[PDB]
Write a protein that binds this ligand. Structure first.
Ligand SMILES: O=C(Nc1nccs1)[C@@H](c1cc(F)ccc1O)N1Cc2ccc(-c3ccc(N4CCNCC4)cc3)cc2C1=O
Ligand SMILES: O=C(Nc1nccs1)[C@@H](c1cc(F)ccc1O)N1Cc2ccc(-c3ccc(N4CCNCC4)cc3)cc2C1=O
Ligand SMILES: Nc1ncnc2c1ncn2[C@@H]1O[C@H](COP(=O)(O)OP(=O)(O)NP(=O)(O)O)[C@@H](O)[C@H]1O
Ligand SMILES: Nc1ncnc2c1ncn2[C@@H]1O[C@H](COP(=O)(O)OP(=O)(O)NP(=O)(O)O)[C@@H](O)[C@H]1O
Ligand SMILES: [Mg+2]
Ligand SMILES: [Mg+2]
Lengths: 294, 294
C-alpha cells in the first residue's frame, strides 16, 4: 500500500523542460537520478501552483496513496511525491503526450480502427476506476495520455475537492454532483474531441452560459466522420437523467463491436490507405516502450 | 514468428553515440523515429564491422529470427535489424550498461544480496537458453546487461551456425566444441568477474598460453570475498570433464539457497550497511524502467 508511493528527495530529481500547465500545476519533463547511481531516467513532474502546509500535505498524501494503488493497463499510476513547499508529483513520462495534442497533430493520418480502439481503451480504464469506486471528475482528451499510438491510459483522476465546465454533466455544473455517471458524460465529450480530431467543444460559448444551453436541450453537434450509430452513443452519454446514460461496461461492448468493423461506423476520407498496427510494428513498440501486460 | 523481428528503414533511426566495440561490431546509443510520428525513442544499435552481401544476409536473418524469439525476463531479445552494407541490429537500450562496467564502478558499494542475486538471474537466463537448445558461446560479464541494479539480462548469445579465450572451456579452445556444458565454464568465469568486482581473468597470461595452464590444472584464484562454499562451485564449473560440471538448473537452486542467507556465503566489508532496495524502490524502478513480468 504505502510502498507503491515513493517519497522522493529534492536532490534525486531535476526539472529540465516545461511540457505544459493546467488548472492545478505545471508539468515538466524531468530526470530521476537514483542515489549513488550515474544514470538519468526521464520522468514527468507536476509541481502544484499553490504552496501547501504540513497538514494540507496530510490530505494530499492520503489521496496520493490511493492514486498509486491503481493496477490496470489503461490507467496511469502515481509513482512518487516530493513534499517541497510547493508539492511535486512524479509519474511515468509519456513521450507521445496527451491524446488531444496527438489527434490534432496527426488529424490527416488517423484511421477509424485507431479512433475506435482508443474509445474502447478509455472505457476500459474508466470501468476499472468505477470498480475501484474512484470518480475521475476531469476526464477529457488532455487527460488521456498516449503511451504508444496503440495504447492510451487515463490520467489525473481522483481529485475530489481540489472547473472544466464544457466537459461536465449538467448535475455537476448545477449541484456539484460527481458520480461515475457524470464521468460517462465527460466520456462522451472526450470521444467528441477524438472524432473531431481535437476541436474545442462549445467553441465561443462562455462557460457561464453552458448549463443554460444544456437545459434547453442543445448538445454537441454530429462530427462529420461519425455515423449516426456513433452519434447516438455520444448523445446517450449526455442524457439529463444520469441513470439513463450508458454504463462504462456497456460502452466497452459497443465500441468493441464497432472496432471489429470500423469502416462501417466511421466515415474517414482515405481510411483504406491509412496506417493500421501490424504485429511486427506492435511487437517492436511494446519491447521498446510498453512492456507491461497490455 | 517473423513478426518478432522488425525490418527497419535507414531513415527511421540514427546513431548518436558510440558505447563500445567488440569482436564483431561497434555498439551505439541510437534513436528510433517512428514513421509519421514526432517522438525519438532511445535504442542500442550494433553495426557489424565487416560489410556483408545479400546472400550472407540470409544467414544473418535466419539467426536474427531465432534471437528475436527468446522470451525470458533474464535474456535480451533482438528487436530489429537494418540490412545496410554493414548490417545494423537493434535492441533495447540499457542505460545502466553492462554488468562488468557496473561492478567496476560500484566496487565499494555492492552488497552480498546483489551479487548472489545476479548469479541467480544469470543462471536463470542460461538455463532458459539451454531449454531452448541455444548455446551462448560468449557469456562474460560484459555480455550481461543491467536493466536495473535489481535485474540483469544476458545478451549476445547464439552466434553458432555462423575469440574470448579466457572465458572458454578447454574443449572449446582445443576442439571448437561449444555446448551448454562449456557455457557453464564461461558462467564460472563470469561469477569470478562479479566477485572480484571486474578483475581481468588470468591477468598477465597471454591468451595463447591459456590452454597450457588449464591442462596443467591451474584455475582462477579464490576471490577475497568468496567463502570456500562459493569458490567450490566456481571450481566445479572448470572441471575438465564437461559432464561433471554443474547444470544451470542446479546453479539456480544453489545460488538461491545462498541468497537467502547472503552474509554466510560472501564476506564483504561494510555489508551490513548495504542491502537490496525496499519494496518502495523496486516498485518505482519497475514502473519507470522495467515493466516486464519479472
Ligand atoms: O500527478 C498527477 N499528474 C501528473 N502529470 C505529470 C506528472 S504528475 C495526478 C495523477 C497522476 C496519476 F498517475 C494518477 C492519478 C492522478 O490524479 N495527480 C495526483 C494528485 C494527488 C493530490 C493532489 C492534491 C490534493 C489536495 C490538495 N490541497 C488543496 C485543496 N484542498 C485539500 C488540500 C492539493 C493537491 C493533486 C494530484 C494530481 O494532479
Ligand atoms: O545484436 C546483438 N547485440 C546488440 N547490441 C547492441 C545493439 S544489438 C546480438 C544479440 C542481441 C540480442 F538481443 C540477443 C541475442 C544476440 O546475439 N547479435 C544478434 C546477431 C545476429 C546475427 C549476427 C551475424 C551473423 C552472421 C554473420 N556472418 C555472415 C556470413 N559471413 C561472415 C559473418 C555476421 C553477423 C550477429 C549478431 C549479434 O551480435
Ligand atoms: N505523464 C505525462 N507525460 C507527458 N506529458 C504529460 C504528462 N502528464 C501531463 N502531460 C502534459 O502536460 C501538459 C499539462 O498537463 P496538466 O497540467 O495536467 O494539464 P491538462 O491535463 O492540460 N489540464 P487539467 O485538466 O487541469 O488537468 C499537457 O499538455 C499534457 O499533455
Ligand atoms: N543493449 C545495450 N545497451 C547498452 N549498452 C550496451 C548494449 N549492448 C552492448 N552495450 C555496450 O556496448 C559495448 C560493446 O558491445 P559489444 O560489441 O557486444 O562488445 P562486447 O560484448 O563488450 N565484447 P564481445 O564479447 O566481443 O561481444 C559494451 O561496453 C557494452 O557494455
Ligand atoms: Mg491533466
Ligand atoms: Mg556483447
Amino acid at each position: 500500500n504505502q510502498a507503491l508511493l515513493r517519497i522522493l528527495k529534492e536532490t534525486e530529481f531535476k526539472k529540465i523542460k516545461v511540457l505544459g500547465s493546467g488548472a492545478f500545476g505545471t508539468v515538466y519533463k524531468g530526470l530521476w537520478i537514483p542515489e549513488g547511481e550515474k544514470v538519468k531516467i526521464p520522468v514527468a513532474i507536476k509541481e502544484l501552483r499553490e504552496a501547501t502546509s504540513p497538514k494540507a500535505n496530510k490530505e494530499i498524501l492520503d489521496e496520493a496513496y490511493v492514486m498509486a494503488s491503481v493496477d490496470n493497463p489503461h490507467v496511469c499510476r502515481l509513482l512518487g511525491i516530493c513534499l517541497t513547499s510547493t508539492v511535486q508529483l512524479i509519474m511515468q513520462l509519456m513521450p507521445f503526450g496527451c491524446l488531444l495534442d496527438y489527434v490534432r497533430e496527426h488529424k490527416d493520418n488517423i484511421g477509424s480502427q485507431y479512433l475506435l480502439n482508443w474509445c474502447v481503451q478509455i472505457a476500459k480504464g474508466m470501468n476499472y476506476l468505477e470498480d475501484r469506486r474512484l470518480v475521475h471528475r476531469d476526464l477529457a482528451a488532455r487527460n488521456v495520455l498516449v503511451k504508444t499510438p496503440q495504447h492510451v491510459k487515463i490520467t489525473d483522476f481522483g481529485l475530489a475537492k481540489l472547473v472544466p465546465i464544457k466537459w461536465m454533466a449538467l448535475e455537476s455544473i448545477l449541484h456539484r454532483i460527481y458520480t461515475h455517471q457524470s464521468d460517462v458524460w465527460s466520456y462522451g465529450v472526450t470521444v467528441w474531441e477524438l472524432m473531431t480530431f481535437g476541436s474545442k467543444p462549445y467553441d465561443g460559448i462562455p462557460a457561464s452560459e453552458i448549463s443554460s444551453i444544456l437545459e434547453k436541450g442543445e448538445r454537441l453537434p454530429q462530427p462529420p466522420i461519425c455515423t449516426i450509430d456513433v452519434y447516438m452513443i455520444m448523445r446517450k452519454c449526455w442524457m439529463i437523467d444520469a441513470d439513463s446514460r450508458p454504463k462504462f461496461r456497456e460502452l466497452i461492448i459497443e465500441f468493441s463491436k464497432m472496432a471489429r468493423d470500423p469502416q462501417r461506423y466511421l466515415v474517414i476520407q482515405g481510411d483504406e490507405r491509412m496506417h493500421l498496427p501490424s504485429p511486427t510494428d506492435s511487437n517492436f513498440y511494446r519491447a521498446l516502450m510498453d512492456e507491461e501486460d497490455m
